[model samples]
Target: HTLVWGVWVNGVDQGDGRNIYIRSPPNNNPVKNLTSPDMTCNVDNRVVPKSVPVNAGDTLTFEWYHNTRDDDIIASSHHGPIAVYIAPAASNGQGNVWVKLFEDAYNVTNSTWAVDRLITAHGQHSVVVPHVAPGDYLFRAEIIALHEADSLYSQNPIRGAQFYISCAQITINSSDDSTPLPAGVPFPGAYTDSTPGIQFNIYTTPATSYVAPPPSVWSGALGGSIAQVGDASLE
Candidate 1:
């Protein structure tokens, strides 16, 4: 007698055999991924969320944290499972150093580099890139978690999961609420701009029989005199 119903899982109960769920790791969760229900989740069953139908002229911010891997035991050693090591494997070495970036998913071979270009040795970093247009994009991170005794750079950790971003369009208004300028200045604009009162005149001569200059015009005094330079001659 199972019908449409709603159930809630409070993420606090773990050792009592509380149920588990599945969440798409953030950055690339899609409607296709959201179609399936959670079959097996974790203790603090927090799933990474995704934002879709994001408008053009809008922005997307990226944030990631180490998955503390909250298992079914509070005091057991398996509670924290997300320990990625720098491959030389601990004599007295430090933490992992990973770096990552985002890219347009449609063109992997020719995609623009996204944020998190250089990740530090401590662990993770987050960023927000603005002015992204409508397109299918993804997040990529390159990890360099190992270094030889006398090497130039770390080269152990590899690339990780690919996230996605879907964009649309939005209207933005940027009106200045500052002190008004003296009346003559033109308003700030987009692309090519026009100012007030300063005239732009176009003269189109009628298409008629072509006129030839006088024969001596090339070398004579009036036409070929050394031209004088003006004081206002800068672009």
Candidate 2:
């Protein structure tokens, strides 16, 4: 049950839950149901009072934890793909407008994983802000925990992979390049129990290659490419 408590924009901590949609009860829990609205941005029918102000190219570094921000990062068992997406706040993040901006899964060269990378980096995952039109937008950071993905949803009510999601209200003050935002896929409809990213078997077999669901990254945006800051060792 890992959760995001801090959204650091360019090394500055925006503070806990300032513009982020944190869970109401504030507990460590991951969403297991793929069709739930939580897949859109963690919580359902929730919005922050304000949006975090940032430039177009600013780096948003998300800090994840198991129980508290100061506690040991998520358990090593909670390993799988991690990604970031952006969409206009007007869409309410419920439409097919969320564009993928960053993704990191498995590194076959050195066998590194997104979760292991987070733990090694003190629970920090960073992605450069995309060059979208200047306006308010919902920036989503997601981590899919596939430790129990081998099981089928039919096995039990809450069986299968888990999705750790968080969203920050972000206002893009300005940008050097306002590339046309790409039409993205719907959240709940974008993934399912059989989706390769969600149905992966992290427990039984080793993954030589991995895909971060469908509709890859947005090529029209500047930050569409995967942001692996220091992965020379992995290569």
Candidate 3:
């Protein structure tokens, strides 16, 4: 299967499973049921004893692996969109608060996909932590594997699309919190088997263009430079 190794901040490895919630005996398994609670973060997962403190605007890198960092990141067949979502929460980040901070799917220019980048980078993925109130936040990184979800046939227990998810608890340090975050959708509420991008036939027709699920990625500036202080800069 596949699992996220850990997190890298500012070019520093935070160690394997540092502040992340990874399942016991981590393996690469995709969650097909969009409504399942496991789709939110993961199932039977263990959270780190302590949350990692990360400064706002720090670029955190996530690495996916099959056996180890040197192994194949994920089966090359699993090609689809990848997204990074964040929510203001203390622990498990229940109910809602999730907002997509970053996302990518198909690239018409080069015909490369988000999943392709993961593989080429040795499963290395990057997303910068956005500016928000300095507090505990749940960061979720997900990969939507659309290899077999053509909607061609029905399969029980596992049908259409596969979702690989990882959750991390981190304390954000920032002196400013005035930047307004974009509205968000819950993990379970955000996706469905019927969703356009999730159950598409990538093989039968292939992808000429693609967009990740819905609501798209946030357009807020990094570190939210919009948060102003004094002077005539306030808009």
Candidate 4:
């Protein structure tokens, strides 16, 4: 099987929007998997720990998907959309430096660190990252692809598919005072609480070390947005 990962703008899942092609590599997982000690912040670095502390020389690495687990993917001739986006200039404006840094380091085309949109699916890809600094950051993901412009399951059909972006703020030395649970992690099959229309769930954490889900789960719209350092302007 093949696995692709990247930012998911909003909660878009199916057609009408593209959310597949991972502009680049080194994607991280969402909350629970990549949170800090206080138990706050999501993977993308969008959510911040109320009391987290950051420092210099703090390497920030992003992959298409980290600590992902494989699951059943019901495929059909119809394809889905892919998401990719960035936060407003007000947030992560400092991280923009690294975006340029990545371009220079990779010797790629685009000068910005943002990943290029890929509308098609082929095989597999992976990348490693480092050089996270201490500061406030914002992260967002959006859709940008479709199966076949003329196909029945296009990204714009009435019931085809929907794609959106999800963003958050992530801090390195956060002290959100969340009081993380003993050491339990969230697993696939878990229970949770719900109030009215709101619903909640839980997963299991690894005891030995932090092992993000496999690439499979991260390939598609796994969850919501996250935190990261970037200065790309959305407005």
Candidate 5:
């Protein structure tokens, strides 16, 4: 679930839904409060100032919580991909715009993904900030749960494909300029029901191999900076 700075919904995490599923309205999914694009999530109507800062190629930690109360594991039945996107805020500092930064569709060798890990593990996941010019940007961390994706369309709309998203306001500082910034796509228009990973059925399909999404991870930076926590450091 996306950890909105200060937004609150009744019965959810202090209005943030930090450890629960923060989904969008039915019909058009993913984008939060899409009907009202200008509505930035705030707690008690107070905006949270941006805090997390990183340099190009730095590993930004992404943490996911699922019922921090008892068993904080997401069920393995919900298998799907996990991705992180970045949007350069307009000169006015609005976080409405965005582009893809990192996408992990499926692990070819291990046959795993964000769903497989988040359902059982709890803590900070890692996403490497791309090599780009220094500026303010919005970091979007999302999880796609595909348990009910046997059909592309869902009878209950909201129950078809679950999208768990969390955003963080961050500042990107420059450390390396040799690697050029990667291009990105608009968020609301980026995904479609027919997208290979989104429309796929993990239950019936064989797990021998996987087809990753388009526009692979940024290759400007050298080595593996986008690795799991406790795994290794960015070069």
Candidate 6:
């Protein structure tokens, strides 16, 4: 289990080390198993009323920590990609409409994904806020741990993969004319059982060569007048 303890902006601690953005677990199930915590407006039935104000070109950083506050990194056993998505908060403060902002799925050089290496190298992850219309949005971070994903259909804890997702409420107050924000996939609808990244056999495959998920990262201008928010669909 893990929690996002810090929400940062340009070297400032926006949330002041508070657990403001992370989704509150229903119980102690912080390590969301399988698809129980599906993506939806009321996904967790929780919300952080406070938000960190940001500009369109700002770099928002999310710092993760284990269930314990000792700053101990997650075990290397959990190896997978680190993805970030953004969704417009509904009038009721629920996040439903979403789009992909940044994704670092694989490292072709070292031949490893973001999980083990991300923690070891950066200890934290970040995403550049896209240049879009000013509005309130939910920035989501996910770590799809695939250490035990070999089993194709078993829900057993020992073999099933784990998904750790968290979201931060942010207010975008400005926009440049960069490329328009690209469309994003729905939450529960984004991933599926048959997805290669979800059902990959990391245990038996050679680390030297492996394919990550499709729709890698959006290759477009990050700044300027391309700022445009695309219409996202509901899950």
Note the Cα lDDT for every prediction shown.
0.17, 0.72, 0.68, 0.23, 0.49, 0.59
Model 1 misplaced stretches (Cα beyond 4 Å): 1-124, 148-235
TM-score comparison, 2 vs 5, better candidate: 2
- Models 1 onward score TM values of 0.20, 0.87, 0.85, 0.26, 0.67, 0.78
Candidate 5 per-residue lDDT, tens place, 69-120, comes to 2234355565777766666555221333445566666666666675665544
Whole-model lDDT for model 4 versus the true structure?
A: 0.23
- Tell me, by TM-score, which candidate is best: 2
Q: What tens-digit string does per-residue lDDT give for candidate 4 at 1-235? A: 1123322222221111112222222232112211131111122322233311232223322223213311121122212223222222243322221111111111124321122212111111111111233334333332211222222222233322112223333233433322221112221111111111011111132112212121122221113222232311221
Best by lDDT: 2
Winner of 2 and 3 under lDDT: 2
Kindly give the stretch of ten consecutive residues in candidate 4 with the minimal lDDT sum: 193-202
As for candidate 3, its clashing pairs are 1-28, 2-28
Provide the lDDT at 184 for model 4.
20
Query: What is the alpha-carbon lDDT for the whole of candidate 3?
Result: 0.68
Query: TM-score of predicted model 6?
Result: 0.78
Off by over 4 Å in 2: 18-25, 221-235
Per-residue lDDT for 102-155 in model 2, tens only?
777887876878777777776778777777788888878788888887775546
How many steric overlaps are in each model, in order? 10, 0, 2, 72, 8, 10
lDDT by residue for model 1 (52-95), tens: 23332222222222322211101111110011111111111112
What is the C-alpha local distance difference test score of candidate 6? 0.59
How big is the RMSD of model 1? 29.6
Candidate 6 error regions (>4 Å): 16-19, 26-37, 40-43, 91-96, 153-158, 220-235
Error of 6 at 100 (Å): 1.6
